[PDB]
Amino acid sequence: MTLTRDSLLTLEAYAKVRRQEHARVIAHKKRRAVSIGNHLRLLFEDETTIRYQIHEMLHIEKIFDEDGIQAELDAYLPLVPDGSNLKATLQIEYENETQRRAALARLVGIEDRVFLRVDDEAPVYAIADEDLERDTAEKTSAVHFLRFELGDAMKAKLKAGAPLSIGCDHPHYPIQAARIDPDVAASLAGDLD
């Protein structure tokens, strides 16, 4: 997939199905979500997850003009897998403002230290926040957009059902590479061409 303005429901048509969509997409995300320790969450993004977010943004902001719709499509384009990469939203979650505030400082650069490993191939580190200019990218955020680029040997093994593991080697958030749910890895394999 890519998505275009014609891929989207109007505000009226979405509002009619919104509650049903919240449930449909929650169910879908069971095949797309991974936790990394107690405070990091990754959602691997696909047509379903991205279309929903766009619908949600348009609904809440009440956006129905053509340039405004297009601007949300273009804002969410970073999440679209392209054939050779998995895309994920990383969220850092802490119980309170002071805790979160302290964590975000301590965890600076964590979005660059999350890695995947398909079977025994070389690990692949996320490339984060390429949609943000250098200065914006340097400001911390509880939310990052990640890209994991996979080569041919990794694509073959993943589609063949090999184990997929995720880790982090940030000094303040060391997570030993651990196998992802095979049902989730199977869903991810389908994103790749």
Q: Could you tell me if 62 and 55 are in contact, meaning their C-beta atoms sit under 8 angstroms apart?
A: no
**What region does 83 belong to: left with phi over 0, alpha with psi -120 to 50, or beta?**
left
Q: Could you tell me if 115 and 168 are in contact, meaning their C-beta atoms sit under 8 angstroms apart?
A: yes
CA-only gyration radius of the chain, Å: 17
108 touches a copy of itself by CB under 8 A: yes
Q: Could you tell me if 105 and 159 are in contact, meaning their C-beta atoms sit under 8 angstroms apart?
A: no
User: Which residues in the 54-83 window bind a copy of itself by CB under 8 A?
Assistant: 56-57, 59-61, 71-72, 75-76
143 touches a copy of itself by CB under 8 A: yes
Residue 129 or 191: which CB sits closer to Cl ion?
A: 191
45 touches Cl ion by CB under 5 A: no
Element (H, E) at 141: none
21 touches a copy of itself by CB under 8 A: no
111 touches Cl ion by CB under 5 A: no
Q: What are phi and psi of 175, to 5 degrees?
A: -125, 115
Residue 20 touches which of a copy of itself, Cl ion, none (Cβ within 5-8 Å per kind): none
47 touches Cl ion by CB under 5 A: yes
Binding residues for a copy of itself (CB under 8 A): 53, 56-57, 59-61, 71-72, 75-76, 89, 91, 95, 97-106, 108, 131-133, 135-136, 139, 141-145
